[PDB]
Amino acid sequence: SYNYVVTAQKPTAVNGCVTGHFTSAEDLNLLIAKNTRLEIYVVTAEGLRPVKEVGMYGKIAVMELFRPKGESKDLLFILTAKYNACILEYKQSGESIDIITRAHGNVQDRIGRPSETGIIGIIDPECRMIGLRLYDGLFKVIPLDRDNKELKAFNIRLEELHVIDVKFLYGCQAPTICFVYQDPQGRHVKTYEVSLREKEFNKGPWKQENVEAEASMVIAVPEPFGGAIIIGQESITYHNGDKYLAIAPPIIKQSTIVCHNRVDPNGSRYLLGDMEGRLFMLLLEKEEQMDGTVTLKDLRVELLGETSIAECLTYLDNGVVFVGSRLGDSQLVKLNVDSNEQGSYVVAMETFTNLGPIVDMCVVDLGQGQLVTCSGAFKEGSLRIIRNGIGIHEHASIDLPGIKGLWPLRSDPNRETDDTLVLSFVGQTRVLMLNEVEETELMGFVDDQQTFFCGNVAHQQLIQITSASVRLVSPKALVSEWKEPQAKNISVASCNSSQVVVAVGRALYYLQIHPQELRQISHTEMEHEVACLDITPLGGLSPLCAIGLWTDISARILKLPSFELLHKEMLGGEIIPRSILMTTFESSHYLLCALGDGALFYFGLNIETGLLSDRKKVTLGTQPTVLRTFRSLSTTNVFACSDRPTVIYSSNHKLVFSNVNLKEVNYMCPLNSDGYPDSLALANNSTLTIGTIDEIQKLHIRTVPLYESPRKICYQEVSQCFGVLSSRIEVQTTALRPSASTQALSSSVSSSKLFEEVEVHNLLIIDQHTFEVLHAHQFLQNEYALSLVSCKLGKDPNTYFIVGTAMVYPEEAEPKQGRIVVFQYSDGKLQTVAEKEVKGAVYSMVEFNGKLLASINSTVRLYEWTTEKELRTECNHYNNIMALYLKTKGDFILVGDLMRSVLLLAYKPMEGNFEEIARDFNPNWMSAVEILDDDNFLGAENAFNLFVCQKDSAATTDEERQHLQEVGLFHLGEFVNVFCHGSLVMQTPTQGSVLFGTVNGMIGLVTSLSESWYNLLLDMQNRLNKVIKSVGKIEHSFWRSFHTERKTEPATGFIDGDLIESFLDISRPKMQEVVANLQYREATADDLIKVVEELTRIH
Amino acid sequence: ADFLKGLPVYNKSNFSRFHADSVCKASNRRPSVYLPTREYPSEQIIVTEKTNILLRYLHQQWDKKNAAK
Amino acid sequence: REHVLKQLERVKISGQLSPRLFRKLPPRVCVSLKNIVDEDFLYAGHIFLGFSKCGRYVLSYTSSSGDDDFSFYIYHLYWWEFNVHSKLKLVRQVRLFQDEEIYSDLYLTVCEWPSDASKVIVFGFNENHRDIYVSTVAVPPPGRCAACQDASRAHPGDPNAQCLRHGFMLHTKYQVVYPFPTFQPAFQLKKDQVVLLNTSYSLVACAVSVHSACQILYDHVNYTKLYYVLESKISLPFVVTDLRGRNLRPMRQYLTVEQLTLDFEYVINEVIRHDATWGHQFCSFSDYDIVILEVCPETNQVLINIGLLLLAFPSLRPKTYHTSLKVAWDLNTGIFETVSVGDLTEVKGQTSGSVWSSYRKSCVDMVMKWLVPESSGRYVNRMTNEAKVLADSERYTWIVL
Amino acid sequence: GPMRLYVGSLHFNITEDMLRGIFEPFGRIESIQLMMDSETGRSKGYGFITFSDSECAKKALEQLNGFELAGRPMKVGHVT
Ligand SMILES: Cc1ccc(NS(=O)(=O)c2cccc(C#N)c2)c2[nH]cc(C#N)c12
Ligand SMILES: [Zn+2]
Predict the structure, then answer these.
(1) A23-40: string of b/e by CB count within 10 Å (b at 16+)?
(2) Region Interaction with CDT1 and CUL4A: which residues (chain A)?
(3) Would you say the CB of residue D32 lies under 6 angstroms from ligand 1?
(4) Which of A386, A778, C321, D39 could disulfide-link to C344, CB 3.0 to 4.6 Å?
(5) Ligand 1 binding pocket includes D17 (Cβ within 6 Å)
(6) Residue extents of the structural domains in chain C
(7) C-alpha dihedral over A1036, A1038, A1042, A1047, to 10 degrees?
(8) Which among C392, C346, C375, C320 has a CA at the least distance from the CA of C82?
(9) What is the CA D35 to chain-centroid distance, rounded?
């Protein structure tokens, strides 16, 4: 009735990517469209530098960069699926980033009918206009003109009603479109001139030609070529009027080309991507003329190699191509001049995780719930296991007890990577070198004292601080040595590249590092014994020393070199600070201080003043924490070593904490080796581990590639494994590549006697710990597995995998034969127990009070499981068009129809048959359904909306008792494939928890509220909308309105959790402006903070 | 290889110091999220001609017919 | 070459689900009328018309006589709730064209507006005149109307006692002369809550609307707004009733009946005097045929085409010519603006018949040329059945007659 | 007596109303029947028209037959 929707994982599929100079005129930008998100990157020496991510109030359909005559940098044109048009500008003054809406408006037409091949947005190369293909029979033109307050769009009638693709041509006196269209006669290519003065078309530069029936793409070739390239199924053609050139290369005949991009600015070369993930170069052979000009001599296509299945491609720089994938992981690849041994020219540099499309999923407690998805399609198919926490990819484990410290080291000065690992023990030190394994000795370093710090310093020197002395080492030799006057022991030590501060009891001594010299600068005596030290220079000579003391349990900031106190903080308790550290996170300075009881304090720190502000406290573990900075994927983060190891990092200018999935870590240090780039070295009581850390974030994701399409998943606790339906393409049969189903330990084949490229379906049994394919059962020829359940039935104590199938024939168009199969996974093999024929496709199955509920075509059926191990029909319901989705609670059954909305059934135990309680009388093209509770039913449909249905709790008569009333509506902007009860949190302002999985790989969470909470948060929304500005000037209320072609309606009974959470990220003054007028009475900007913090804990 | 030589270079220094993680991770994936608190007024507004195509057309033709005399 | 199950796999991985992709495939469910109609109505003369756009109702009409009044016709409309295989429940029964003696069997058609499912509209047609009957009937309440409950509470009422919005009708009859104006339902009803009616001498834009504690037509010529309420010379005389048929009570919730008129003779005379290039050789005009070319339902423009027969000097003696005037008509303003004026072509020997047929062909040509397809959202639904299949908005469910 | 006429080669978008429009100015029409495709809902492109008086039907045939409508020449003939 009152629902709350929040993002648990942002969409991961790439819908579009574009390159240009957008931030500055000089820098080179990659812009990526992920549904609602626009990511802005700068190409650098190290690769991609993130600059800005923006969330649009719309699904990005068009994304083009362009530069009008009087412009210093590119402008960005965006069209959303709801026809919000904007022109955007990146602006920067000092450090402040803003995106400016140069122009905006909504381009929707009521009269218009959305086209087959969807929204197409093209810009004239001379920036004279924007052209849109939104609807069959209409071409919308937005004239681009600076000196106007109104960019008035107009429609031009288009006689060609079925347009496949359109581009603007280069090198034309008038703006000229080129397009492919379909009519009874076939496919054709035509041109028109677009005159602004006439608001009309004119005969184009050249005539019409019959083209390939499968012609699907138009490329506008730049000068000096001009003209267009038309990509077909098995043919590529160039046209420029009198010139016509066609090639039919065998290489492209196997698969369809789905995306292209220009490599060379003059259009001599293009990248092409096909459905199988093949990458081609299309070469245009230039011909120089006596006259200054150039004509196309020939066309060649060349197979470069294999990438992910690309939605879009863009060339970046220095042979680097970005592959944006919808169906698989996105990639950076290098094109080389030399092939490799396999004949491949393509080399993968980076992969980006794409969960999409999530086709199915389930929650399992592998008290923290792990989510296992069916992800991807075709060769990109995979399982993904999603957890809260951060994982270590262990590459090495070494039996070494008693480690008391850990330092990384560059032995060679010209090497910019670590080659050495120095280890500490009670009174000893050992040096280790990476090829691989095995130790050594480093000249200048002692081995018979305990190292308290060591590593690289200024002037190409090295340092080692023990309990005895400070050793400066250059050709490696001792070049300076500092000792305390009376040769007393050094007790605490800290060091940067330039400075050393060491403690001798209550004595403090400050040293500087010079060419071959350790220069004592100043000395002081502290009030109490020194507990810990730090001198990290913050944005390489610190004016500050951070110190923790015994006795008073205090943290202090001292000026260097005077040792003047700038700030004292009483931490309190009877436990000494163990570790202290100064750090930058997001150009923001902090002091971190960890107590021996497991508590951590963090302050804001001002470099100039030395002032600590905002004592915040967190609890990490029971054991004392040791803090160490590390670098991971270009960001600086702190590892907190304890019985509960943690990473500290920054999100939106605030400190975040994430659990690392290890038992215990005493000490760690970063290790940037040749063999282990940006690795980590960890030490417990007995082991030295080396490994890579997963992306520093909330979600930790594991990938299990299948190399074929997963379709359904379910868990079988008793077998301790998963059942997964999958299908592979085989060719006329013989497979394309090895995949999960062809590589099982054991395998079986259906022997049922009940009954171009082909699909071959399988049930995979997959180990829950290792994710090894233990067994694969292949179905019958032409049999498609549709549904899967794991369950016990009737009085039978066994647990089965049950599969519903459908027989699919080439010379037939809908299922009329089907089968339900009961398997038992025992002793390593899948046994067929029972088989039940049916007269159609078994779309869906659920276990239902020890019985099997199934949907077959338009029929919902309940089977009992007899003593004789057979399924026997109990009762049927036939009032459906196509029952694709089933959910049950108690005796209640929610029925999702592809075309006929939702229906609520009940099983009557005494009558032994179904009763239709109520149904939703609005047509809705369903994608997924869930039961929120007894009276509340959640549906996701085909227009990217959510809605909630209710039984009428005011129904006086029986006719009224029978309507489900649509009490919640919300435009989500995603396509939901699966709904799931569960939580990624340990586990109140919210009741219930439904996770969902989407085509774009987004994971969301729906939960319920009290009327009270809803009313508060809806008001909040409305206030947040008046304070928060939307890029493109799109209204939030418009975005979230329920939208279909039949009706448009404001969202009700749904709170945008993402909006609500963004209250924590706005400025304090703007925070207070939101809370301007409120009741509890008055404004509690801090109380609203405390409220929202609660809401963020649900995921 | 003929077709792979002379692949465009916009800045030779790009990707020079590119070293990926041992599990194919290199780029930073968490950009700061833009959340405008204040906004610059739009210079121009996009709008559609309310007039029906056929109207516009029939009006035009006649207007350039009486402009003949 | 596509199969239902291949299409569904596509859906899950692409996320593109549209009725127009399965439009390749056969109906999902066919039902036989024999199997979903009750026994009582089985021989009571029902002729089923089609499905509501929302797909929840089939509806039909009956044509019986009775009493001593043979060759004397009564017309009832009925809403049936479709529930796939189960039998059709009767939801509403309503007599059409009240107070009206119909001495001839009508061609009958029911229409739904593009984006308004609250009222439906019915047309009945057919010795050198033609009679046209038009009825606007309320649509049954979707679920449970609070106001309707009040109508069975605050008023004792009974079964079939409903509030105003969910229970009012509006009748009207007019005569029409040669050449018989065309029937253009798609245009006539393209603006919600409005029907444009060609009386031969004028075009009348009528609008009905229900409101609770403004104007659908003339906002900011011949206008005729008045109000009606519940409980017991103008362009187009009418009767406003409830479902039972009691006259509604005028006011001066509630109902709003508006009537904007466009007098053809005025328009013609003024376009000539003002805009026509040949107005100074014009004498008079004999006859005219008005055809709607477009309705722009947001801007409230109505483009019409006026075929004329007239007398003019050639440039000695006068003679009969044919021309077409094109005229826009604001509905908020009430003013019309010339859009185009044609030349005169001598009619010589061609009959009036062939002049009009020929004028209408050119109108059809023009609509067809400039015709842009619409979304399934906004089409005008037109149902008819004289003496095989009744299909849903999407043709995935069929009733086989 | 009355008179049925075949009307064929119609654009698939001509409606029953449009035929009535085009033909009716010639005389009284007893029945108009455009053959529709029971599967698709679109017209088969042909139909029959019945004029109450045959001398009318004859004029309509003369005037309309072999003349373009929607760019498709219309055929009109006598039917037994
Ligand atoms: C000339 C003409 C135009 C339109 C119709 N009928 S309609 O308004 O229902 C219609 C039909 C098809 C497309 C549209 C659209 N946009 C509208 C006509 N009926 C008889 C006619 C004659 N003479 C006539
Ligand atoms: Zn009511």
Answers:
(1) beeebbbbbbbbbbbbbb
(2) 755-1099
(3) no
(4) C321
(5) yes
(6) 26-213+224-263+377-401, 264-348
(7) 180
(8) C392
(9) 11
Q: Which residues contact D55 (CB under 8 A, 6 or more apart)?
A: none
Q: At what angle do helices D54-64 and D16-23 cross, to 10 degrees?
A: 100
- Given the DSSP bridges, would you call strands A746-749 and B44-48 parallel, antiparallel or unpaired? unpaired
What are the structure tokens assigned to A114, written together? 């959305």
Closest CA to A930 of A871, A985, A1008: A1008
HEC secondary structure over C38-59:
CCCCCCCCCEEEEECCCCCEEE
Task: Find the helix or strand (DSSP H, E) in which D18 lies.
Answer: helix D16-23
Q: CA dihedral in degrees (A723, A725, A731, A733; nearest 10)?
A: 60
Of C293, C298, C338, the CB nearest to B54: C293
Cβ-based contacts under 8 A for chains B and C? 38
Q: Within 13 A of A8's CA, how many CA atoms are on the CB side? A: 29
The DSSP element (H or E) to which C267 belongs, if any, is helix C264-274
CA distance readout (Å), A795 to A831, A864, A868: 20, 10, 11
Report the 10 Å Cβ neighbour count for A958.
7
> Maximum CA pair distance of chain D?
37
Q: What gap in Å lies between CA C340 and CA C293, rounded to an integer?
A: 13
Judged on CB neighbours under 10 Å (0-12, 13-18, 19+), A147 is exposed
A contact chains, 3+ CB pairs < 8 A: B, C
Give dist(CA C76, CA A673) in Å, integer.
88
Residue-wise DSSP of C367-385: HHHH-----TTSPPEEE--
Nearest in space to A822 (alpha carbons), one of A850, A798, A802: A802
Structure tokens, A1014: 């809803």
In 3D, which of A883, A808, A831, A879 has the Cα closest to residue A853? A883
Question: In the block, which residue shows the tokens 């076939």?
Answer: A186
Q: Could you tell me which of C381, C207, C180 has the C-alpha nearest to residue C300?
A: C207
Q: Alpha helices, DSSP H only, in A704-800?
A: none
- For residues A1008 and A1006, what is the distance between their CA atoms, to the nearest angstrom? 7
Breaks (C-N over 2.5 A) in chain D follow: none
The count of C-alpha atoms lying within 13 angstroms of the C-alpha of A1024, restricted to the half-sphere facing its C-beta, is 24
Looking at residue A165, the DSSP 8-state letter turns out to be: E
- What is the token pair recorded at A365? 């407690």
* Residue found by looking up tokens 């492109």 in the block: D45
| Candidate from C184, C374, C378 with most ligand 1 atoms within 8 A of CB, to mutate | C184
Q: Do chains D and C touch (3 or more CB pairs under 8 A)?
A: yes
Select from C17, C55, C375 the Cβ nearest to the Cβ of A942.
C17
Q: Among A583, A585, A622, A584, which Cα is nearest to A600's?
A: A622
Q: What share of chain D is helix, strand, coil (3-state, %, to 5)?
A: 30, 40, 30
A863 Cβ neighbours under 8 A, 6+ residues apart: A820, A836, A851, A852, A853, A854, A871, A872, A873, A874
* Residue extents of the structural domains in chain D: 1-80
User: What is the DSSP secondary structure assignment for residue A1074, as one 8-state letter?
Assistant: H
This PDB structure is determined at a resolution in Å of: 2.9
Question: Which residue has 């994938």 as its token pair?
Answer: A325
Distance A971 CA to ligand 2 centre (A): 29
- Give the helix ranges, DSSP H, for A852-943: none
Report DSSP state, residue A172. Answer: -
Given the candidates 3.40.50.300, 3.40.50.2000, 3.40.50.1820, 3.30.70.330, the CATH classification of the domain at D1-80 is 3.30.70.330
Q: C-alpha A138: how far from its chain's center?
A: 37
